[PDB]
Design an enzyme around this catalytic site. Structure first.
Site, PDB file in Angstrom:
ATOM      1  N   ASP A 113       0.829  -1.212   0.000  1.00 44.28           N
ATOM      2  CA  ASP A 113       0.000   0.000   0.000  1.00 44.28           C
ATOM      3  C   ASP A 113       0.863   1.262   0.000  1.00 44.28           C
ATOM      4  O   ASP A 113       1.362   1.685   1.051  1.00 44.28           O
ATOM      5  CB  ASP A 113      -0.949   0.007   1.209  1.00 44.28           C
ATOM      6  N   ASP A 115      -1.381   5.564  -5.467  1.00 46.62           N
ATOM      7  CA  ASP A 115      -1.820   4.663  -4.394  1.00 46.62           C
ATOM      8  C   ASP A 115      -2.046   3.245  -4.918  1.00 46.62           C
ATOM      9  O   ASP A 115      -3.102   2.949  -5.484  1.00 46.62           O
ATOM     10  CB  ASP A 115      -3.081   5.203  -3.730  1.00 46.62           C
TER      11      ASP A 115
HETATM   12  C1  LIG Z   1      -7.718  -0.322   2.996  1.00 52.38           C
HETATM   13  C2  LIG Z   1      -6.867  -0.479   1.749  1.00 52.38           C
HETATM   14  C3  LIG Z   1      -6.215  -1.849   1.707  1.00 52.38           C
HETATM   15  C4  LIG Z   1      -7.181  -3.001   1.601  1.00 52.38           C
HETATM   16  C5  LIG Z   1      -8.023  -2.962   0.345  1.00 52.38           C
HETATM   17  C6  LIG Z   1      -7.271  -3.315  -0.925  1.00 52.38           C
HETATM   18  C7  LIG Z   1      -8.175  -3.677  -2.110  1.00 52.38           C
HETATM   19  C8  LIG Z   1      -9.274  -2.645  -2.427  1.00 52.38           C
HETATM   20  C9  LIG Z   1      -8.749  -1.395  -3.161  1.00 52.38           C
HETATM   21  O1  LIG Z   1      -9.874  -0.560  -3.525  1.00 52.38           O
HETATM   22  C10 LIG Z   1     -10.114   0.557  -2.771  1.00 52.38           C
HETATM   23  C11 LIG Z   1      -9.345   0.809  -1.638  1.00 52.38           C
HETATM   24  C12 LIG Z   1      -9.576   1.963  -0.896  1.00 52.38           C
HETATM   25  C13 LIG Z   1     -10.599   2.844  -1.280  1.00 52.38           C
HETATM   26  C14 LIG Z   1     -11.381   2.565  -2.404  1.00 52.38           C
HETATM   27  C15 LIG Z   1     -12.445   3.520  -2.865  1.00 52.38           C
HETATM   28  O2  LIG Z   1     -12.221   4.230  -3.827  1.00 52.38           O
HETATM   29  N1  LIG Z   1     -13.613   3.566  -2.204  1.00 52.38           N
HETATM   30  C16 LIG Z   1     -14.660   4.500  -2.633  1.00 52.38           C
HETATM   31  C17 LIG Z   1     -13.952   2.743  -1.054  1.00 52.38           C
HETATM   32  C18 LIG Z   1     -11.124   1.421  -3.159  1.00 52.38           C
HETATM   33  C19 LIG Z   1      -8.730   2.217   0.313  1.00 52.38           C
HETATM   34  O3  LIG Z   1      -9.208   2.726   1.324  1.00 52.38           O
HETATM   35  N2  LIG Z   1      -7.422   1.874   0.221  1.00 52.38           N
HETATM   36  C20 LIG Z   1      -6.464   2.013   1.332  1.00 52.38           C
HETATM   37  C21 LIG Z   1      -5.412   3.111   1.073  1.00 52.38           C
HETATM   38  O4  LIG Z   1      -4.596   2.813  -0.062  1.00 52.38           O
HETATM   39  C22 LIG Z   1      -6.098   4.462   0.907  1.00 52.38           C
HETATM   40  O5  LIG Z   1      -6.571   4.952   2.226  1.00 52.38           O
HETATM   41  C23 LIG Z   1      -5.825   0.654   1.641  1.00 52.38           C
END
Ligand SMILES: C[C@@H]1CCCCCCCOc2cc(cc(C(=O)N(C)C)c2)C(=O)N[C@H]([C@@H](O)CO)C1
Length: 369
Positions: free
Chosen positions: A35, A219
């Site tokens: 990440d 990201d």
């Molecule tokens: C929690 C993340 C790691 C686990 C998930 C990885 C696979 C899913 C990636 O798709 C998304 C992840 C995140 C946000 C969205 C999004 O656009 N919406 C509207 C919810 C989609 C997210 O929050 N990413 C974070 C961190 O990189 C940003 O803060 C890291």
């Protein structure tokens, strides 16, 4: 020595890319989501319906309790846990062992993903956004301080999915053409400045500050290209216009409904290419990366989700932008490089590209303050 790290990433589509790591003594093996949008190293450390394994602090003789709690909120999902340190290695990485801060995840909400095959997260961004505050040294900082690993890494994300995280350098066999660099505007997120946007060669003709309102970041832990509301509306309007041959549910453009076509008949040609111009290394100079529809129509007959979505926290160049490019996070020189990846996207009449130099005046005005 980088060949050992080629192909060290795996993933499921839309569920993140992970690298194998070990923590503790004796080594406990865990798959760790990569990440660049956060700065905490954290692992599941208690049972969870979606975890097939977790960190067991009681079984590690090198674990030290820091006696402090922590929570990290993300755009999607959050967790809380207990801080500590332990010894950490990367089997298909450099042959080193580092003592790193580790958040032992004891409670979480919409963080772990059913069937993703990863159990923790490696936040590769800077200490300024680490939780609980910037005194918690991020993993990569610890790695560089404690070993001779150079202060840079690169990500080759390939579009069930795989890729490479080259730790400590650049593997020139993984890309073609030249690397083009954009300055890291500020060391917190990997913040960059977009200076121009074109769709099928037509400038969106917005004030370039809109593209970076209120920031733009790279990201690897976000799937989509996310755009500020005003930019998202202009882009969708333009993409709708280019593809008006066919009509799509109104929920398709919002990412809710998928669209399908008879296997092997996807009408790629009716969807436009998107070019993002990034601030360059010399005065009045930019370069562009060009994204094909095969990147922003994410496969899920052949069925696809629209992987461009709206944001209220700035532009996010997520995985569908990074896929097909070799991306160098050159922390030592405060810059991010882009080149066409060896696993690039294949269109029959179009190609993803990284092209320069371009002249762009008043690029400093594109940063939001
Ligand atoms: C929690 C993340 C790691 C686990 C998930 C990885 C696979 C899913 C990636 O798709 C998304 C992840 C995140 C946000 C969205 C999004 O656009 N919406 C509207 C919810 C989609 C997210 O929050 N990413 C974070 C961190 O990189 C940003 O803060 C890291």
């Amino acid at each position: 020595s980088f060949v050992e790290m080629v192909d060290n990433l795996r993933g499921k589509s839309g569920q993140g890319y992970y690298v194998e790591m070990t923590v503790g003594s004796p080594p406990q093996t865990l798959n760790i989501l990569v990440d660049t949008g956060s700065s905490n190293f954290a692992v599941g450390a208690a049972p969870h319906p979606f975890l097939h394994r977790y960190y067991q602090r009681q079984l590690s003789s090198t674990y030290r309790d820091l006696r402090k709690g922590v929570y990290v909120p993300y755009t999607q999902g959050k967790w809380e846990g207990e801080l500590g340190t332990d010894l950490v290695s990367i089997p298909h990485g450099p042959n080193v062992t580092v003592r790193a801060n580790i958040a032992a995840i004891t409670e979480s909400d919409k963080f772990f993903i059913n069937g993703s095959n990863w159990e923790g997260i490696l936040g590769l961004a800077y200490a300024e956004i680490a939780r609980p505050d910037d005194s918690l040294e991020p993993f990569f900082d610890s790695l560089v301080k404690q070993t001779h690993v150079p202060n840079l890494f690169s990500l080759q994300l390939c579009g069930s999915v795989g890729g490479s995280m080259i730790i400590g350098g650049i593997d020139h066999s993984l890309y073609t053409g030249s690397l083009w660099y954009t300055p890291i505007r500020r060391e917190w997120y990997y913040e960059v400045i977009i200076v121009r946007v074109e769709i099928n060669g037509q400038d969106l003709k917005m004030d370039c500050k809109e593209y970076n309102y209120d920031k733009s970041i790279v990201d690897s832990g976000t799937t989509n290209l996310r755009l500020p509301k005003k930019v998202f509306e202009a882009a969708v309007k333009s993409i709708k216009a280019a593809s008006s041959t066919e009509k799509f549910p109104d929920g398709f453009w919002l990412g809710e409904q998928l669209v399908c076509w008879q296997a092997g008949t996807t009408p790629w040609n009716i969807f436009p290419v998107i070019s993002l111009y990034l601030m360059g290394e010399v005065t009045n100079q930019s370069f562009r990366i060009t994204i094909l529809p095969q990147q922003y129509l994410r496969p899920v007959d052949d069925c696809y989700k629209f992987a461009i979505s709206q944001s209220s926290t700035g532009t996010v160049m997520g995985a569908v932008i990074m896929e097909g490019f070799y991306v160098v996070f050159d922390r030592a020189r405060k810059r991010i490089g882009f080149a066409v990846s060896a696993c690039h996207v294949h269109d029959e009449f179009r190609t993803a590209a990284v092209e320069g130099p371009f002249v762009t005046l008043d690029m400093e005005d594109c940063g939001y303050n």
